[PDB]
PDB file of all heavy atoms in Angstrom:
ATOM      1  N   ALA A   1      -1.920  16.528   8.553  1.00 10.77           N
ATOM      2  CA  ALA A   1      -1.421  15.193   8.286  1.00 10.77           C
ATOM      3  C   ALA A   1      -1.537  14.932   6.794  1.00 10.77           C
ATOM      4  O   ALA A   1      -2.150  15.713   6.066  1.00 10.77           O
ATOM      5  CB  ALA A   1      -2.169  14.118   9.096  1.00 10.77           C
ATOM      6  N   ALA A   2      -0.949  13.828   6.354  1.00  9.00           N
ATOM      7  CA  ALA A   2      -1.038  13.434   4.966  1.00  9.00           C
ATOM      8  C   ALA A   2      -2.473  13.000   4.644  1.00  9.00           C
ATOM      9  O   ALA A   2      -3.265  12.660   5.524  1.00  9.00           O
ATOM     10  CB  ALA A   2      -0.070  12.316   4.647  1.00  9.00           C
ATOM     11  N   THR A   3      -2.795  13.052   3.346  1.00  7.50           N
ATOM     12  CA  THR A   3      -4.146  12.735   2.887  1.00  7.50           C
ATOM     13  C   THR A   3      -4.520  11.268   3.062  1.00  7.50           C
ATOM     14  O   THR A   3      -5.697  10.954   3.077  1.00  7.50           O
ATOM     15  CB  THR A   3      -4.285  13.102   1.411  1.00  7.50           C
ATOM     16  OG1 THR A   3      -3.420  12.278   0.630  1.00  7.50           O
ATOM     17  CG2 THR A   3      -3.874  14.522   1.191  1.00  7.50           C
ATOM     18  N   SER A   4      -3.537  10.391   3.208  1.00 10.01           N
ATOM     19  CA  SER A   4      -3.790   8.975   3.356  1.00 10.01           C
ATOM     20  C   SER A   4      -2.657   8.333   4.139  1.00 10.01           C
ATOM     21  O   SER A   4      -1.491   8.738   4.011  1.00 10.01           O
ATOM     22  CB  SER A   4      -3.931   8.281   2.015  1.00 10.01           C
ATOM     23  OG  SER A   4      -4.169   6.892   2.170  1.00 10.01           O
ATOM     24  N   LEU A   5      -3.021   7.379   5.000  1.00  8.33           N
ATOM     25  CA  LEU A   5      -2.020   6.669   5.778  1.00  8.33           C
ATOM     26  C   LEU A   5      -1.098   5.819   4.925  1.00  8.33           C
ATOM     27  O   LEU A   5       0.002   5.481   5.399  1.00  8.33           O
ATOM     28  CB  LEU A   5      -2.731   5.778   6.805  1.00  8.33           C
ATOM     29  CG  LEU A   5      -2.999   6.508   8.108  1.00  8.33           C
ATOM     30  CD1 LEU A   5      -3.881   5.619   8.925  1.00  8.33           C
ATOM     31  CD2 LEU A   5      -1.697   6.788   8.820  1.00  8.33           C
ATOM     32  N   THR A   6      -1.505   5.397   3.722  1.00  7.54           N
ATOM     33  CA  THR A   6      -0.689   4.491   2.938  1.00  7.54           C
ATOM     34  C   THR A   6       0.618   5.115   2.450  1.00  7.54           C
ATOM     35  O   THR A   6       1.503   4.383   2.013  1.00  7.54           O
ATOM     36  CB  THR A   6      -1.481   4.018   1.707  1.00  7.54           C
ATOM     37  OG1 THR A   6      -1.681   5.120   0.827  1.00  7.54           O
ATOM     38  CG2 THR A   6      -2.836   3.504   2.127  1.00  7.54           C
ATOM     39  N   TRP A   7       0.746   6.447   2.494  1.00  7.92           N
ATOM     40  CA  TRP A   7       1.970   7.123   2.086  1.00  7.92           C
ATOM     41  C   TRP A   7       3.114   6.798   3.038  1.00  7.92           C
ATOM     42  O   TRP A   7       4.292   6.741   2.637  1.00  7.92           O
ATOM     43  CB  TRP A   7       1.756   8.620   2.022  1.00  7.92           C
ATOM     44  CG  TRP A   7       0.671   9.103   1.093  1.00  7.92           C
ATOM     45  CD1 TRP A   7      -0.372   9.894   1.421  1.00  7.92           C
ATOM     46  CD2 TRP A   7       0.478   8.762  -0.297  1.00  7.92           C
ATOM     47  NE1 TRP A   7      -1.175  10.120   0.344  1.00  7.92           N
ATOM     48  CE2 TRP A   7      -0.683   9.427  -0.732  1.00  7.92           C
ATOM     49  CE3 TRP A   7       1.188   7.988  -1.230  1.00  7.92           C
ATOM     50  CZ2 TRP A   7      -1.154   9.347  -2.027  1.00  7.92           C
ATOM     51  CZ3 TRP A   7       0.718   7.903  -2.506  1.00  7.92           C
ATOM     52  CH2 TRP A   7      -0.438   8.580  -2.913  1.00  7.92           C
ATOM     53  N   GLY A   8       2.779   6.606   4.303  1.00  6.42           N
ATOM     54  CA  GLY A   8       3.737   6.461   5.371  1.00  6.42           C
ATOM     55  C   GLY A   8       3.168   7.070   6.629  1.00  6.42           C
ATOM     56  O   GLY A   8       2.080   7.667   6.622  1.00  6.42           O
ATOM     57  N   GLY A   9       3.896   6.911   7.730  1.00  6.66           N
ATOM     58  CA  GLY A   9       3.479   7.461   9.000  1.00  6.66           C
ATOM     59  C   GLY A   9       3.144   6.387  10.008  1.00  6.66           C
ATOM     60  O   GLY A   9       3.769   5.316  10.046  1.00  6.66           O
ATOM     61  N   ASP A  10       2.155   6.678  10.839  1.00  7.82           N
ATOM     62  CA  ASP A  10       1.862   5.877  12.016  1.00  7.82           C
ATOM     63  C   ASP A  10       0.842   4.781  11.720  1.00  7.82           C
ATOM     64  O   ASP A  10       0.928   4.132  10.669  1.00  7.82           O
ATOM     65  CB  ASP A  10       1.349   6.763  13.149  1.00  7.82           C
ATOM     66  CG  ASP A  10       2.418   7.701  13.682  1.00  7.82           C
ATOM     67  OD1 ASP A  10       3.612   7.339  13.661  1.00  7.82           O
ATOM     68  OD2 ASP A  10       2.060   8.821  14.117  1.00  7.82           O
ATOM     69  N   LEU A  11      -0.121   4.578  12.601  1.00  8.47           N
ATOM     70  CA  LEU A  11      -1.109   3.524  12.390  1.00  8.47           C
ATOM     71  C   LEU A  11      -2.372   3.853  13.178  1.00  8.47           C
ATOM     72  O   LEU A  11      -2.309   4.085  14.393  1.00  8.47           O
ATOM     73  CB  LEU A  11      -0.530   2.172  12.839  1.00  8.47           C
ATOM     74  CG  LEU A  11      -1.254   0.836  12.663  1.00  8.47           C
ATOM     75  CD1 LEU A  11      -0.189  -0.216  12.513  1.00  8.47           C
ATOM     76  CD2 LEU A  11      -2.162   0.459  13.803  1.00  8.47           C
ATOM     77  N   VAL A  12      -3.497   3.864  12.498  1.00 10.06           N
ATOM     78  CA  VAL A  12      -4.800   4.118  13.076  1.00 10.06           C
ATOM     79  C   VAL A  12      -5.533   2.787  13.215  1.00 10.06           C
ATOM     80  O   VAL A  12      -5.721   2.068  12.237  1.00 10.06           O
ATOM     81  CB  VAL A  12      -5.621   5.117  12.260  1.00 10.06           C
ATOM     82  CG1 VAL A  12      -6.999   5.285  12.850  1.00 10.06           C
ATOM     83  CG2 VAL A  12      -4.950   6.485  12.305  1.00 10.06           C
ATOM     84  N   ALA A  13      -5.934   2.460  14.443  1.00 10.03           N
ATOM     85  CA  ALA A  13      -6.608   1.209  14.724  1.00 10.03           C
ATOM     86  C   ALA A  13      -7.921   1.506  15.448  1.00 10.03           C
ATOM     87  O   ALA A  13      -8.015   2.475  16.214  1.00 10.03           O
ATOM     88  CB  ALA A  13      -5.733   0.286  15.582  1.00 10.03           C
ATOM     89  N   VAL A  14      -8.924   0.681  15.184  1.00  7.44           N
ATOM     90  CA  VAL A  14     -10.243   0.830  15.769  1.00  7.44           C
ATOM     91  C   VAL A  14     -10.702  -0.556  16.199  1.00  7.44           C
ATOM     92  O   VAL A  14     -10.835  -1.452  15.380  1.00  7.44           O
ATOM     93  CB  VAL A  14     -11.275   1.447  14.805  1.00  7.44           C
ATOM     94  CG1 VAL A  14     -12.656   1.407  15.414  1.00  7.44           C
ATOM     95  CG2 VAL A  14     -10.900   2.876  14.423  1.00  7.44           C
ATOM     96  N   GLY A  15     -10.996  -0.699  17.499  1.00  7.89           N
ATOM     97  CA  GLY A  15     -11.522  -1.951  18.045  1.00  7.89           C
ATOM     98  C   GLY A  15     -10.559  -3.104  17.937  1.00  7.89           C
ATOM     99  O   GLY A  15     -11.013  -4.259  17.825  1.00  7.89           O
ATOM    100  N   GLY A  16      -9.256  -2.837  17.959  1.00  8.96           N
ATOM    101  CA  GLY A  16      -8.261  -3.878  17.867  1.00  8.96           C
ATOM    102  C   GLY A  16      -7.849  -4.257  16.455  1.00  8.96           C
ATOM    103  O   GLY A  16      -6.849  -4.941  16.285  1.00  8.96           O
ATOM    104  N   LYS A  17      -8.600  -3.810  15.443  1.00 11.42           N
ATOM    105  CA  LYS A  17      -8.307  -4.052  14.054  1.00 11.42           C
ATOM    106  C   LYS A  17      -7.565  -2.874  13.423  1.00 11.42           C
ATOM    107  O   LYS A  17      -7.760  -1.705  13.815  1.00 11.42           O
ATOM    108  CB  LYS A  17      -9.592  -4.310  13.278  1.00 11.42           C
ATOM    109  CG  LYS A  17     -10.290  -5.592  13.621  1.00 11.42           C
ATOM    110  CD  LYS A  17     -11.435  -5.852  12.677  1.00 11.42           C
ATOM    111  CE  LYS A  17     -12.170  -7.123  13.034  1.00 11.42           C
ATOM    112  NZ  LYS A  17     -11.259  -8.301  13.076  1.00 11.42           N
ATOM    113  N   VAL A  18      -6.759  -3.178  12.414  1.00 11.13           N
ATOM    114  CA  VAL A  18      -6.032  -2.168  11.652  1.00 11.13           C
ATOM    115  C   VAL A  18      -6.974  -1.522  10.648  1.00 11.13           C
ATOM    116  O   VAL A  18      -7.523  -2.200   9.774  1.00 11.13           O
ATOM    117  CB  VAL A  18      -4.816  -2.761  10.938  1.00 11.13           C
ATOM    118  CG1 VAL A  18      -4.123  -1.689  10.134  1.00 11.13           C
ATOM    119  CG2 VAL A  18      -3.861  -3.358  11.922  1.00 11.13           C
ATOM    120  N   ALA A  19      -7.160  -0.211  10.765  1.00 11.35           N
ATOM    121  CA  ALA A  19      -7.935   0.521   9.766  1.00 11.35           C
ATOM    122  C   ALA A  19      -7.101   0.784   8.522  1.00 11.35           C
ATOM    123  O   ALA A  19      -7.522   0.420   7.413  1.00 11.35           O
ATOM    124  CB  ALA A  19      -8.443   1.828  10.349  1.00 11.35           C
ATOM    125  N   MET A  20      -5.923   1.362   8.678  1.00  9.82           N
ATOM    126  CA  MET A  20      -5.002   1.559   7.570  1.00  9.82           C
ATOM    127  C   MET A  20      -3.595   1.738   8.137  1.00  9.82           C
ATOM    128  O   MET A  20      -3.413   2.363   9.168  1.00  9.82           O
ATOM    129  CB  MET A  20      -5.398   2.760   6.708  1.00  9.82           C
ATOM    130  CG  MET A  20      -4.632   2.882   5.408  1.00  9.82           C
ATOM    131  SD  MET A  20      -4.784   1.384   4.401  1.00  9.82           S
ATOM    132  CE  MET A  20      -6.505   1.477   3.935  1.00  9.82           C
ATOM    133  N   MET A  21      -2.618   1.164   7.435  1.00 10.84           N
ATOM    134  CA  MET A  21      -1.191   1.306   7.752  1.00 10.84           C
ATOM    135  C   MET A  21      -0.435   1.670   6.487  1.00 10.84           C
ATOM    136  O   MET A  21      -1.009   1.602   5.377  1.00 10.84           O
ATOM    137  CB  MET A  21      -0.668   0.022   8.392  1.00 10.84           C
ATOM    138  CG  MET A  21      -0.597  -1.184   7.518  1.00 10.84           C
ATOM    139  SD  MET A  21       0.413  -2.410   8.373  1.00 10.84           S
ATOM    140  CE  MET A  21      -0.579  -2.720   9.802  1.00 10.84           C
ATOM    141  N   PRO A  22       0.814   2.102   6.592  1.00 10.41           N
ATOM    142  CA  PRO A  22       1.626   2.358   5.380  1.00 10.41           C
ATOM    143  C   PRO A  22       1.875   1.128   4.538  1.00 10.41           C
ATOM    144  O   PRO A  22       2.321   0.094   5.028  1.00 10.41           O
ATOM    145  CB  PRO A  22       2.916   2.938   5.950  1.00 10.41           C
ATOM    146  CG  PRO A  22       2.510   3.571   7.184  1.00 10.41           C
ATOM    147  CD  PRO A  22       1.442   2.731   7.768  1.00 10.41           C
ATOM    148  N   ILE A  23       1.596   1.252   3.239  1.00  8.95           N
ATOM    149  CA  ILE A  23       1.757   0.190   2.270  1.00  8.95           C
ATOM    150  C   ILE A  23       3.132   0.299   1.627  1.00  8.95           C
ATOM    151  O   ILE A  23       3.517   1.358   1.124  1.00  8.95           O
ATOM    152  CB  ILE A  23       0.660   0.282   1.185  1.00  8.95           C
ATOM    153  CG1 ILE A  23      -0.701   0.084   1.845  1.00  8.95           C
ATOM    154  CG2 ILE A  23       0.872  -0.788   0.141  1.00  8.95           C
ATOM    155  CD1 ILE A  23      -1.851   0.100   0.860  1.00  8.95           C
ATOM    156  N   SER A  24       3.894  -0.788   1.646  1.00  7.46           N
ATOM    157  CA  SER A  24       5.245  -0.815   1.087  1.00  7.46           C
ATOM    158  C   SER A  24       5.250  -1.524  -0.256  1.00  7.46           C
ATOM    159  O   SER A  24       4.650  -2.591  -0.410  1.00  7.46           O
ATOM    160  CB  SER A  24       6.227  -1.488   2.028  1.00  7.46           C
ATOM    161  OG  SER A  24       5.933  -2.863   2.157  1.00  7.46           O
ATOM    162  N   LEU A  25       5.947  -0.932  -1.225  1.00 11.29           N
ATOM    163  CA  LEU A  25       6.017  -1.432  -2.599  1.00 11.29           C
ATOM    164  C   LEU A  25       7.396  -2.016  -2.859  1.00 11.29           C
ATOM    165  O   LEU A  25       8.411  -1.316  -2.731  1.00 11.29           O
ATOM    166  CB  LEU A  25       5.693  -0.331  -3.604  1.00 11.29           C
ATOM    167  CG  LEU A  25       4.322   0.325  -3.443  1.00 11.29           C
ATOM    168  CD1 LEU A  25       4.142   1.393  -4.495  1.00 11.29           C
ATOM    169  CD2 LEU A  25       3.230  -0.710  -3.529  1.00 11.29           C
ATOM    170  N   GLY A  26       7.436  -3.304  -3.220  1.00 14.72           N
ATOM    171  CA  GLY A  26       8.672  -3.983  -3.513  1.00 14.72           C
ATOM    172  C   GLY A  26       8.663  -4.681  -4.856  1.00 14.72           C
ATOM    173  O   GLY A  26       7.887  -4.300  -5.741  1.00 14.72           O
ATOM    174  N   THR A  27       9.523  -5.695  -5.023  1.00  9.89           N
ATOM    175  CA  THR A  27       9.655  -6.426  -6.291  1.00  9.89           C
ATOM    176  C   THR A  27       8.337  -7.074  -6.732  1.00  9.89           C
ATOM    177  O   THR A  27       7.979  -7.035  -7.901  1.00  9.89           O
ATOM    178  CB  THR A  27      10.779  -7.464  -6.175  1.00  9.89           C
ATOM    179  OG1 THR A  27      12.009  -6.802  -5.891  1.00  9.89           O
ATOM    180  CG2 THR A  27      10.955  -8.222  -7.467  1.00  9.89           C
ATOM    181  N   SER A  28       7.585  -7.645  -5.776  1.00 11.75           N
ATOM    182  CA  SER A  28       6.291  -8.257  -6.111  1.00 11.75           C
ATOM    183  C   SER A  28       5.297  -7.215  -6.600  1.00 11.75           C
ATOM    184  O   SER A  28       4.526  -7.491  -7.540  1.00 11.75           O
ATOM    185  CB  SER A  28       5.761  -9.028  -4.913  1.00 11.75           C
ATOM    186  OG  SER A  28       6.583 -10.112  -4.584  1.00 11.75           O
ATOM    187  N   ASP A  29       5.324  -6.038  -5.997  1.00 11.63           N
ATOM    188  CA  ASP A  29       4.437  -4.959  -6.417  1.00 11.63           C
ATOM    189  C   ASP A  29       4.820  -4.421  -7.795  1.00 11.63           C
ATOM    190  O   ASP A  29       3.933  -4.089  -8.603  1.00 11.63           O
ATOM    191  CB  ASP A  29       4.485  -3.845  -5.377  1.00 11.63           C
ATOM    192  CG  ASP A  29       3.985  -4.298  -4.028  1.00 11.63           C
ATOM    193  OD1 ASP A  29       2.768  -4.278  -3.818  1.00 11.63           O
ATOM    194  OD2 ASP A  29       4.818  -4.706  -3.191  1.00 11.63           O
ATOM    195  N   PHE A  30       6.126  -4.341  -8.060  1.00 13.18           N
ATOM    196  CA  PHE A  30       6.655  -4.032  -9.395  1.00 13.18           C
ATOM    197  C   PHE A  30       6.119  -5.002 -10.431  1.00 13.18           C
ATOM    198  O   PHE A  30       5.632  -4.609 -11.501  1.00 13.18           O
ATOM    199  CB  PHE A  30       8.187  -4.081  -9.312  1.00 13.18           C
ATOM    200  CG  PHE A  30       8.898  -3.775 -10.598  1.00 13.18           C
ATOM    201  CD1 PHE A  30       9.150  -2.473 -10.977  1.00 13.18           C
ATOM    202  CD2 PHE A  30       9.345  -4.798 -11.397  1.00 13.18           C
ATOM    203  CE1 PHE A  30       9.818  -2.210 -12.148  1.00 13.18           C
ATOM    204  CE2 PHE A  30      10.005  -4.549 -12.561  1.00 13.18           C
ATOM    205  CZ  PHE A  30      10.248  -3.245 -12.949  1.00 13.18           C
ATOM    206  N   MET A  31       6.179  -6.308 -10.096  1.00 13.28           N
ATOM    207  CA  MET A  31       5.778  -7.347 -11.036  1.00 13.28           C
ATOM    208  C   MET A  31       4.282  -7.330 -11.323  1.00 13.28           C
ATOM    209  O   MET A  31       3.866  -7.423 -12.471  1.00 13.28           O
ATOM    210  CB  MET A  31       6.227  -8.709 -10.519  1.00 13.28           C
ATOM    211  CG  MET A  31       7.727  -8.903 -10.560  1.00 13.28           C
ATOM    212  SD  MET A  31       8.281 -10.423  -9.762  1.00 13.28           S
ATOM    213  CE  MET A  31       7.727 -11.639 -10.944  1.00 13.28           C
ATOM    214  N   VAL A  32       3.447  -7.150 -10.276  1.00 14.05           N
ATOM    215  CA  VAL A  32       2.002  -7.120 -10.521  1.00 14.05           C
ATOM    216  C   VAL A  32       1.612  -5.847 -11.263  1.00 14.05           C
ATOM    217  O   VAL A  32       0.660  -5.868 -12.064  1.00 14.05           O
ATOM    218  CB  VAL A  32       1.191  -7.331  -9.235  1.00 14.05           C
ATOM    219  CG1 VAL A  32       1.358  -8.735  -8.732  1.00 14.05           C
ATOM    220  CG2 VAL A  32       1.549  -6.344  -8.182  1.00 14.05           C
ATOM    221  N   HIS A  33       2.264  -4.711 -10.981  1.00 14.28           N
ATOM    222  CA  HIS A  33       1.912  -3.487 -11.716  1.00 14.28           C
ATOM    223  C   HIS A  33       2.255  -3.620 -13.184  1.00 14.28           C
ATOM    224  O   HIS A  33       1.487  -3.154 -14.037  1.00 14.28           O
ATOM    225  CB  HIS A  33       2.583  -2.254 -11.090  1.00 14.28           C
ATOM    226  CG  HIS A  33       1.840  -1.679  -9.919  1.00 14.28           C
ATOM    227  ND1 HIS A  33       1.943  -2.182  -8.651  1.00 14.28           N
ATOM    228  CD2 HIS A  33       0.951  -0.660  -9.854  1.00 14.28           C
ATOM    229  CE1 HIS A  33       1.174  -1.489  -7.846  1.00 14.28           C
ATOM    230  NE2 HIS A  33       0.555  -0.549  -8.550  1.00 14.28           N
ATOM    231  N   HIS A  34       3.384  -4.251 -13.518  1.00 10.35           N
ATOM    232  CA  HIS A  34       3.666  -4.454 -14.941  1.00 10.35           C
ATOM    233  C   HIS A  34       2.751  -5.514 -15.568  1.00 10.35           C
ATOM    234  O   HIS A  34       2.460  -5.417 -16.763  1.00 10.35           O
ATOM    235  CB  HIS A  34       5.156  -4.726 -15.163  1.00 10.35           C
ATOM    236  CG  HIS A  34       5.973  -3.470 -15.000  1.00 10.35           C
ATOM    237  ND1 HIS A  34       6.256  -2.901 -13.778  1.00 10.35           N
ATOM    238  CD2 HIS A  34       6.499  -2.642 -15.934  1.00 10.35           C
ATOM    239  CE1 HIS A  34       6.957  -1.801 -13.962  1.00 10.35           C
ATOM    240  NE2 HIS A  34       7.114  -1.610 -15.254  1.00 10.35           N
ATOM    241  N   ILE A  35       2.268  -6.492 -14.778  1.00  9.37           N
ATOM    242  CA  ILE A  35       1.208  -7.391 -15.275  1.00  9.37           C
ATOM    243  C   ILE A  35      -0.051  -6.601 -15.605  1.00  9.37           C
ATOM    244  O   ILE A  35      -0.682  -6.829 -16.660  1.00  9.37           O
ATOM    245  CB  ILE A  35       0.906  -8.493 -14.241  1.00  9.37           C
ATOM    246  CG1 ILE A  35       2.053  -9.514 -14.152  1.00  9.37           C
ATOM    247  CG2 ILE A  35      -0.402  -9.230 -14.551  1.00  9.37           C
ATOM    248  CD1 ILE A  35       2.258 -10.269 -15.426  1.00  9.37           C
ATOM    249  N   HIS A  36      -0.431  -5.676 -14.728  1.00 10.67           N
ATOM    250  CA  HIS A  36      -1.591  -4.824 -14.945  1.00 10.67           C
ATOM    251  C   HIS A  36      -1.446  -3.989 -16.217  1.00 10.67           C
ATOM    252  O   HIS A  36      -2.369  -3.918 -17.020  1.00 10.67           O
ATOM    253  CB  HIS A  36      -1.807  -3.905 -13.743  1.00 10.67           C
ATOM    254  CG  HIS A  36      -2.136  -4.652 -12.490  1.00 10.67           C
ATOM    255  ND1 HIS A  36      -2.715  -5.906 -12.500  1.00 10.67           N
ATOM    256  CD2 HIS A  36      -2.027  -4.288 -11.184  1.00 10.67           C
ATOM    257  CE1 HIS A  36      -2.883  -6.307 -11.259  1.00 10.67           C
ATOM    258  NE2 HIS A  36      -2.503  -5.344 -10.434  1.00 10.67           N
ATOM    259  N   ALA A  37      -0.276  -3.335 -16.379  1.00 10.43           N
ATOM    260  CA  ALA A  37       0.048  -2.591 -17.579  1.00 10.43           C
ATOM    261  C   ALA A  37      -0.080  -3.429 -18.845  1.00 10.43           C
ATOM    262  O   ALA A  37      -0.652  -2.967 -19.847  1.00 10.43           O
ATOM    263  CB  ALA A  37       1.455  -2.016 -17.475  1.00 10.43           C
ATOM    264  N   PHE A  38       0.425  -4.657 -18.790  1.00 10.09           N
ATOM    265  CA  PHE A  38       0.327  -5.584 -19.917  1.00 10.09           C
ATOM    266  C   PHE A  38      -1.131  -5.887 -20.284  1.00 10.09           C
ATOM    267  O   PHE A  38      -1.520  -5.749 -21.457  1.00 10.09           O
ATOM    268  CB  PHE A  38       1.102  -6.860 -19.598  1.00 10.09           C
ATOM    269  CG  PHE A  38       0.773  -8.008 -20.475  1.00 10.09           C
ATOM    270  CD1 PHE A  38       0.937  -7.950 -21.845  1.00 10.09           C
ATOM    271  CD2 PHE A  38       0.351  -9.200 -19.917  1.00 10.09           C
ATOM    272  CE1 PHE A  38       0.609  -9.013 -22.634  1.00 10.09           C
ATOM    273  CE2 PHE A  38       0.036 -10.278 -20.705  1.00 10.09           C
ATOM    274  CZ  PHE A  38       0.185 -10.184 -22.058  1.00 10.09           C
TER     275      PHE A  38
END
């Protein structure tokens, strides 16, 4: 499997809670990353 769930794929849950799911990057993520760079 991939080294981390955030790349994509399925979903691992434990006790009804989400342990990790795929993280999607959009316009808001673009904007905060360039804020970070600044």
Side-chain angles (χ1 to χ4, degrees):
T3 64
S4 180
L5 272 171
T6 68
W7 301 126
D10 293 328
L11 185 151
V12 176
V14 173
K17 292 188 181 304
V18 179
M20 190 57 69
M21 67 167 64
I23 297 183
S24 67
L25 302 180
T27 300
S28 295
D29 298 275
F30 181 84
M31 290 173 72
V32 291
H33 277 82
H34 287 75
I35 290 295
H36 296 336
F38 163 59

